[PDB]
Amino acid sequence: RYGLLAAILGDKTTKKLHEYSRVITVDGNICSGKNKLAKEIAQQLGMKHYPEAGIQYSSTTTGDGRPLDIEFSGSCSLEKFYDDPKSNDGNSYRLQSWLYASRLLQYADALEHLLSTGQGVVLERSIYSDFVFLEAMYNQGYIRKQCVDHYNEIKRLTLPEYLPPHAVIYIDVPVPEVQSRIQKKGDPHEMKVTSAYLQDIENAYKKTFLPKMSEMCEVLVYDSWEAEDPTKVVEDIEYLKYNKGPWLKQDDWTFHYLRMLVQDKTEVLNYTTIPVYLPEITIGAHQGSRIYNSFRELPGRKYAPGYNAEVGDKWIWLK
Amino acid sequence: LREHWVHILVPAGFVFGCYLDRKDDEKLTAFRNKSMLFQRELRPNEEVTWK
Amino acid sequence: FYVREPVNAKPNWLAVGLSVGASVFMWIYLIQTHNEDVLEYKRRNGL
Amino acid sequence: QWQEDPEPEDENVYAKNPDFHGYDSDPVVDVWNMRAVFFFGFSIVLVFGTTFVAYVPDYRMQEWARREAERLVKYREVNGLPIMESNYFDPSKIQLPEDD
Amino acid sequence: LDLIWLEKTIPKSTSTLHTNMTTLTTNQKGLIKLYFMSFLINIILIIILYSINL
Amino acid sequence: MLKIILPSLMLLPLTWLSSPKKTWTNVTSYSFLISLTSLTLLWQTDENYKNFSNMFSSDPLSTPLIILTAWLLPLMLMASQNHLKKDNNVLQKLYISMLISLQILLIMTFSATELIMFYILFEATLIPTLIIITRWGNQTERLNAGIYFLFYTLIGSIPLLIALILIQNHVGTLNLMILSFTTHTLDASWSNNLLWLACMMAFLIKMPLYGVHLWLPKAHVEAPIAGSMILAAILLKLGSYGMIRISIILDPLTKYMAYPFILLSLWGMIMTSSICLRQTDLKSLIAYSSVSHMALVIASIMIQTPWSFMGATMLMIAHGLTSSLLFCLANSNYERIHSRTMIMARGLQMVFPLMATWWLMASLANLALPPSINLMGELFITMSLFSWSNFTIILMGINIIITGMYSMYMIITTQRGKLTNHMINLQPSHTRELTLMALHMIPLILLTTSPKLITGLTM
Amino acid sequence: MMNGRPGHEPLKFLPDEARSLPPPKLNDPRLVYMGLLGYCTGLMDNMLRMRPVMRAGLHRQLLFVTSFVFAGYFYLKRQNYLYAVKDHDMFGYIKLHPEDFPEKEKKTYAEILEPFHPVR
Amino acid sequence: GARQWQPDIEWAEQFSGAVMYPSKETAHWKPPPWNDVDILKE
Amino acid sequence: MPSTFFNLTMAFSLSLLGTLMFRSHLMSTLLCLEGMVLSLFIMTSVTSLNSNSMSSMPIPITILVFAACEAAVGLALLVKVSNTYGTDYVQNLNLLQ
Amino acid sequence: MNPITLAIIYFTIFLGPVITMSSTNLMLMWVGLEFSLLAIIPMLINKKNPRSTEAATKYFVTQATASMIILLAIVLNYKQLGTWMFQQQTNGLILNMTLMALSMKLGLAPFHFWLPEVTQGIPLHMGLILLTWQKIAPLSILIQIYPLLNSTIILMLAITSIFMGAWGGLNQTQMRKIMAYSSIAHMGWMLAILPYNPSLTLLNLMIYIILTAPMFMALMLNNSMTINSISLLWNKTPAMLTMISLMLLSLGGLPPLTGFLPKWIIITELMKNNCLIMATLMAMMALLNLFFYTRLIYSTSLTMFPTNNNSKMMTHQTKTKPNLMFSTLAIMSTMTLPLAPQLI
Ligand SMILES: CCCCCCCCCCCCCCCCCC(=O)OC[C@H](COP(=O)(O)OCCN)OC(=O)CCCCCCCCCCCCCCCCC
Ligand SMILES: Nc1ncnc2c1ncn2[C@@H]1O[C@H](COP(=O)(O)OP(=O)(O)O)[C@@H](O)[C@H]1O
């Protein structure tokens, strides 16, 4: 694995970086046709387009990559999020906390690809933009105040270490038009979502996310019309100058340490498991032991990658 | 010795055990026959009293 | 298989040969030392 | 509230496996875990053990001493010696502190 | 005599004696001046321990 | 004695290497035979103790126990196959191994020539026991119970460590054989009066004395059945075995330095016996029964008359077997009832006919019915205690009357009276439960036929 | 302690004088223990790294059982010497300074009169 | 049918706080930030 | 010399009492700390000079060379502190409590 | 760190103790101590968090004044004996200074306040070096001068440390500080036998190093500075739960494990020398140390604390492995007791 040995002997990120190599996130409301833009921009500069973080994004990330059972993936339902807001069990907060962990894994995987291959990164919504969902959830009855504090504490502990998005794109369509966009896409859980809740999501971006990041990175606001025109947006990205931002000080000997972090997923989310016992987050020892003693028995997961024979690994007796 | 290699674990311990306990004797063999109460003189064609 | 392949799937064949080969050098030096030792002990003392 | 499992009930292992012997749920392991426990438990420990323990000979010499007494009592009485003299370590051997 | 008197005397008391002793020894401001002075006191006492047992 | 031990160690490899489904039978079947090899030590056709080798010895006092220590591992593993059958297949193999190490360690401790070998192995037995009690303990309070079991033994243990290193410097070897055939006569100073207390106190603590016995009621309450069997049958008796071999030295002081303990124990015997009379938790009552019947033992290992000692050896082996039997049947009621309360579960004989016969015989062993080694034991300690002072019969006479009352009350309010209306229906008795009992009592019947084997060093 | 002894080898592991002592039998229980101590290290490693406990790193298992043991013979070889020096040193002094360690006569019990405390 | 009591949240709570056996004043003490970095600034 | 050697030694103890009794600014301490190194340097040089022990004069200077860097490290910590608090008072160094 | 700087520093942090040990001219022993002081300070502030600057500024002042006191002892000796090194004749006060000073750098007894605080603000890694490769240097200086130091003071610093360490540890819940406190305690035993049998100090140290180095690489495997954090070990990595249990009970003196030997032979040597007063009190409060060790045992192993849902996410990802050293130093430490005679 990458180490100071490799750094000492060549393997420097600096010499692998090029103009097209940046961390570009595109953030929008629940429905901004964001997906297309990203894949489009991705297609433009060959940028590895990372999909929006999912409940089982981590399982697709690890081992076989087949989707995990819900309880193995933290028992989070976006579906139940919508049909049962302010639920007794709090699936909505557990959904949000797992989502933050998933993008933490996605952002870290993205940074690892960026510093190793040197190909730039498009990851849709980012950890920085995740807060808008929680702000809106606390604005209504979805989450209580402490729940907010617990997310903020995890965010303050883990997000600063990772370097900021080079530029952020904002595909904005008004509160009413996204709900009609919602109305025609087929899922019924997305439908019937609060107009005021959608109001709080985009308002939270405009009030906090874009100004905040307006110095940390090159924010590119785009209206819907500019959108659906990947060519134009792509053009503008190729147009902005990547100057302002903390990325300027990343010398090779500084990148090495950041790389070795993202290279270690177990650390990336080390502070995501901090022992703060808010009730929704708590596994519980008896349920948690069963869930672990069950997730660990899945084929290829009992032992470390390369050593479990079930999936067809061989040479274990000499590894 | 197949699928029966876990049945011959304990038994084997016994044998090894007996192998040591009869080896401890070999070490503690001074006063072999030099004890007072039991100091008989060697009977013909007998190497040592107690082995 | 795995989306992210293991780094250990096919053996590090160097790690075998310096692990196996090292141990066989240990013994051949160790067993040598003993018999050699026994002799030195015998000759240095009466026998 | 935090997440935890709902109380697990204890199964009536006697509902299935109506021949349950108390060792394991699946029937063959149970049968073979009593056919080997009554056997190694009772049949060759309480029986072979008691046989061997019963035949330990003259344990702690108490079978030897009821004869040695008999020949000592035979010898002491016929030769007129006291059956249990009153000092054991002979007085002659002792070198009592002379002054005191 | 069981429960309270034989549990308050031997098992519990020893529990309390220590608990209280840790509370005083570990309640420290964290300020360096205080701590350091204590180094001063120590030097003084050790200077004496040698002096009087010269 | 490495067949009683090496084959034992190999049990550990078998519990681990063996199949998850077959792990239980390989271990239980093999240690039954391990007990059969243990029986060979009983072949003493002469007085000379059997010094197997430098570190390992077995004399009349240790031999009756080594066999019991080997015997209970089979039983312990048979009484814990139910609870611990809900585990993950690696928690079991840990519990089975923990039980295996206890007798490996206990077999060696009872079969050890060097007194500090006793100490290292003596205080090691706490590690396996604390894990059995704390890790698998059902109640919220086992963390507490574990603390009590570790500190009371540990605070007693470090004084013994200092004392034994002290005698090694004073005499020059801690070898029980030599220490016996050498002149170590304490000189009744104020200091020696402390040495004596240092050596005896650690042993007096795990042998619950009236003053320090609170650890045992708390420990057996939340301990799993296998841990409670080990604590009552072998663990507490470690303290008695120690007092017999350590008082060979410190010969003069115990003549006058024992009064404090003797009186603590005999009055303690009465009060511990009495509180059994109104205690709602059955496991609680058996534990205090264990304190009182062990308070008799510390009052015979201190009077130090030949009869006391073998009264002690008789009672320790006998009460060990009886107590487990009581703790084992208490568990069978606890698992179907799901509560330790004595008042619930009334009338069981009506629904569990045989377990009640086992309950009756266990209680008759608990009280002193006469054709039992249990009575011979008490009859002898009683005699010597009377010799120490004729008045002792009064206190050892209030205990006999109380012991009869609580022993029968356990039978009268648990196994007689009208049946409880409808507790969770009580499933019939497994054959394992009944054997685990039969395995305890059939040896109690056989030993009572020839008491000579468990009579101690004195006789 | 034993340092400062005449002839001390200032940084050597086992001076050749230790040749005179018998070599440790390779199967000495201790070296065999070190072996088991080692196998366990190996097995433990596999466990902490989440590999099949016994069926993995069969090369490593060997490195371990064979590294620990190798170490043993050469360590025990020394510790054995150190202890042997201790006697050379100890016994010698007992003689060179004989008066301080005088042979004592122990009166046969017949003569000695240890007091008898009766148990009664 | 048995659940050896595994510790609940409350049993866990005590072990939090910058001092186990809190004193009247030392009670005010607050656990140090998990990141090992503090908020103070001005 | 015997008389003087006393003054220097008490100078070191007066400097000792100083560094072991802080008051506000740290730079005072570090400054005091240096007062000792001067007293040690003076005493080492003095005895070496009246023992005519020239083989040892290297030491009086090695003492200063190591002491200078020691102080360099000390001041960089000091600058680091009045960059994080900007007031350099031993008073605010209490987060570790 | 520019890898070059990393090398220079690390070399100094390593040349620092080594010069101390190798040289006999005390002066050269002092600069060995001085380097160690200079090399450790850069690493201590690597995160450069506000807590860190506090740590280093304390460590440095405590280390610096002690270094100056050690130099004063050498300077004074130079005038009481022309030699640059302590001798039989050395004035008693000259040696006592060296004991106090060196007991400050090692942080024993009434000077035990800096260590717990610097152990709290430095990373787990630099915590190990600050606890174990920085104790070798000063101890070397003491072990060399043992014939001449005072039996009374050492014992007082020894006993005090044992008590302070134990009592301090009972209340602490931060792991870094629990270890800092343990080190104070073990350091105490070590300095108790120095006047009598230095060779045992070197055993009570190695065993402490072979015990603490695995224990800390355990704390950082999951980088848990909280007991609550180490308690969820069962979910993050289950195997280390078994050995973490034995190593911590080994750190305290419980008899089957390797940890008993240092306490046992130190007690045997002190009783051989007749300190059956001192040895007894030390062993007794030594038992207090195990109480806080077992309280941690409870939280981490014997009882399973509740975990957060995101812990399932960290399980998914492959856990970066613990170096081999953990194993080799966990076993050689948890169970070597059967081989004690050759160790001593
Ligand atoms: C002198 C005797 C000293 C005491 C010996 C007996 C106690 C040994 C120490 C036990 C300390 C820990 C107690 C609590 C352990 C909890 C273990 C647990 O919770 O289970 C999970 C753990 C790791 O799990 P994993 O192997 O990855 O797979 C299963 C995943 N659920 O599962 C495991 O960890 C499995 C491996 C556990 C270690 C096996 C040890 C077996 C027992 C060793 C006995 C040694 C006896 C030596 C006798 C010497 C006599 C001279
Ligand atoms: N933190 C969050 N909390 C709740 N829902 C979220 C969060 N992050 C993303 N989502 C979900 O993502 C959905 C939007 O994704 P969508 O735009 O459909 O993906 P695509 O980019 O493929 O079109 C929303 O319905 C929203 O519920």
One DSSP character per residue, A44-110 reads HHT-EEPPPP-TTHHHHHSTT-PPPPTTTTTS--HHHHHHSTT-SS-HHHHHHHHHHHHHHHHHHHH
Q: Is A178 in the pocket of ligand 2 (CB under 6 A)?
A: no
**Residue F50 β-bridge partners:** F58
Q: Is A79 in the pocket of ligand 2 (CB under 6 A)?
A: no
Q: How far apart are CA J311 and CA J15, in angstroms?
A: 42
* Host domain of residue F181: 2-459
**Residue A223 β-bridge partners:** A172
Beta strand pairing call for A167-172 and A218-223: parallel
Of E22, E43, E54, the CB nearest to J171: E22
Closest CA to G15 of G69, G85, G98: G85
CB neighbours of J104 closer than 8 A, spacing ≥ 6? E39, J62, J65, J66, J69, J111, J114
Q: Name the resolution in angstroms.
A: 3.3
Distance J241 CA to ligand 1 centre (A): 9
* Amino acid (1-letter code) at residue J260: F
Q: Is F124 in the pocket of ligand 1 (CB under 6 A)?
A: yes
**What is the total residue count of chain H?**
42
CB neighbours of J158 closer than 8 A, spacing ≥ 6? J108, J109, J188, J189, J191, J192, J278, J282
Q: Give A266 to chain G, closest Cα distance, Å.
A: 14
Q: What is the 3-state secondary structure (H, E, C) of chain F?
A: CCCCCHHHHCHHHHHHHCCCCCHHHHHHHHHHHHHHHHHHHHCCCCCCCECCCCCCCECCCCHHHHHHHHHHHHHHHHHCCCCCCCCCCCCHHHHHHHHHHHHHHHHHHHCCCEHHHHHHHHHHCHHHHHHHHHHHCCCCCHHHHHHHHHHHHHHHHHHHHHHHHHHHHHHCCCEHHHHHCCCCCCCCCCCHHHHHHHHHHHHHHHCCCCCCCCHHHHHHHHCCHHHHHHHHHHHHHHHHHHHHHHCCCCCCCHHHHCHHHHHHHHHHHHHHHHHHHCCCEHHHHHHHHHHHHHHCHHHCCCCCCHHHHHHHHHHHHHHHHHHHHHHHHHHHHHHHHCCCECCCCCCHHHCCHHHHHHHHHHHHHHCCCCCCHHHHHHHHHHHHHHHHCCCHHHHHHHHHHHHHHHHHHHHHHHCCCCCCCCCCCCCCCCHHHHHHHHHHHHHHHHHHHCHHHHCCCCC
Q: How far apart are CA G56 and CA G64, in angstroms?
A: 13
* Host domain of residue I20: 2-97
Q: What is the DSSP letter of A18?
A: -
Q: Is A108 in the pocket of ligand 2 (CB under 6 A)?
A: no
Number of domains in chain I: 1
Q: How far apart are CA G62 and CA G38, in angstroms?
A: 9
Chain centroid offset of residue A108 CA: 9
3-state DSSP assignment of residue A23: strand
Residues D37, F78: C-beta atoms closer than 8 Å: yes
Do residues F444 and F80 lie in contact, with contact meaning Cβ atoms separated by under 8 Å?
no
**Residue A221 β-bridge partners:** A170
Cα–Cα distances (Å) from F455 to A135, F447, J184, in that order, read 80, 11, 52
Q: How far apart are CA H1 and CA F425, in angstroms?
A: 14
**What is the total residue count of chain E?**
54
Closest CA to A115 of A235, A230, A260, A234: A260
Closest CA to A128 of A153, A172, A159: A159
Residues E43, J58: C-beta atoms closer than 8 Å: no
Interchain CB contact of G48 with A (< 8 Å): no
CB neighbours of A152 closer than 8 A, spacing ≥ 6? none
**Which residue shows structure tokens 């330790």?**
F340
Interchain CB contact of G28 with J (< 8 Å): no
Q: How far apart are CA J267 and CA J253, in angstroms?
A: 12
Closest CA to J112 of J70, J42, J167: J167
Q: How far apart are CA D32 and CA D40, in angstroms?
A: 12
CB neighbours of F223 closer than 8 A, spacing ≥ 6? F132, F133, F137, F142, F145, F231
Closest CA to J44 of J124, J107, J113, J105: J124
Q: How far apart are CA I36 and CA I20, in angstroms?
A: 12
Domain ranges of chain E: 1-54
Give the containing element (helix H, strand E) for G35.
helix G29-48
**Would you call A311 exposed, middle or buried from its count of C-beta atoms within 10 A (0-12, 13-18, 19+)?**
middle
Closest CA to A273 of A256, A260, A288, A258: A288
Q: Chain E partners of F148 at a C-beta cutoff of 8 Å?
A: 11
Residues A307, G52: C-beta atoms closer than 8 Å: yes
The dihedral through the CA atoms of F210, F214, F217, F220 has a sign that is negative
Helices (H) and strands (E) in chain B, counts: 1, 0
- What's the token pair of residue D18? 């109506």
Q: How far apart are CA D4 and CA F196, in angstroms?
A: 54
**Which residue shows structure tokens 């297949």?**
F89
The dihedral through the CA atoms of F259, F261, F267, F270 has a sign that is negative
**Residue A306 β-bridge partners:** none
- CB count within 10 Å of CB F297 equals 25
Interface residues of chain F, partner chain E, Cβ below 8 Å: 148, 152, 211-212, 214, 271, 275
Chain centroid offset of residue D21 CA: 29
Distance F94 CA to ligand 1 centre (A): 6
Cα–Cα distances (Å) from G53 to A295, A307, A316, D99, F363, in that order, read 19, 10, 11, 79, 48
3-state DSSP assignment of residue J123: coil
Strand order in the sheet with A167-172: A48-49, A121-122, A23-28, A167-172, A218-223
Instruction: Return the ∠ at Cα G117 (arms to G115 and G119), rounded to 5°.
Output: 160
Q: Which numbered atom of ligand 1 lies nearest the CA of F104? A: 50
Instruction: Name which residue sits closest to atom 12 of ligand 2, judged by CA.
Output: A30
For G35-66, letters b (16+ CB in 10 Å) and e give bebbbbbbbbbbbbbbbbbbebbbbbbbbbbb
- What's the token pair of residue F99? 């039980």
Q: How far apart are CA A98 and CA G57, in angstroms?
A: 36
Instruction: Return the ∠ at Cα I95 (arms to I92 and I96), rounded to 5°.
Output: 130
3-state DSSP assignment of residue A172: strand
Side-chain-side CA neighbours of residue A192 (13 Å): 11
Nearest-by-CA chain H residue for J298:
H7
Q: Give J110 to chain E, closest Cα distance, Å.
A: 7
Cα–Cα distances (Å) from D42 to A143, D49, F29, F451, H37, in that order, read 65, 10, 11, 21, 68
- CB count within 10 Å of CB A89 equals 15
**Residue I25 β-bridge partners:** I89
Cα–Cα distances (Å) from G69 to A299, G33, G77, in that order, read 37, 8, 12
Instruction: Name which residue sits closest to atom 50 of ligand 1, judged by CA.
Output: F105
Q: How far apart are CA F75 and CA F232, in angstroms?
A: 14
Q: Chain F partners of J276 at a C-beta cutoff of 8 Å?
A: 162, 166
Q: How far apart are CA A234 and CA A242, in angstroms?
A: 14
Distance J208 CA to ligand 2 centre (A): 53
- What's the token pair of residue J54? 């506090």
Instruction: Name which residue sits closest to atom 5 of ligand 2, judged by CA.
Output: A78
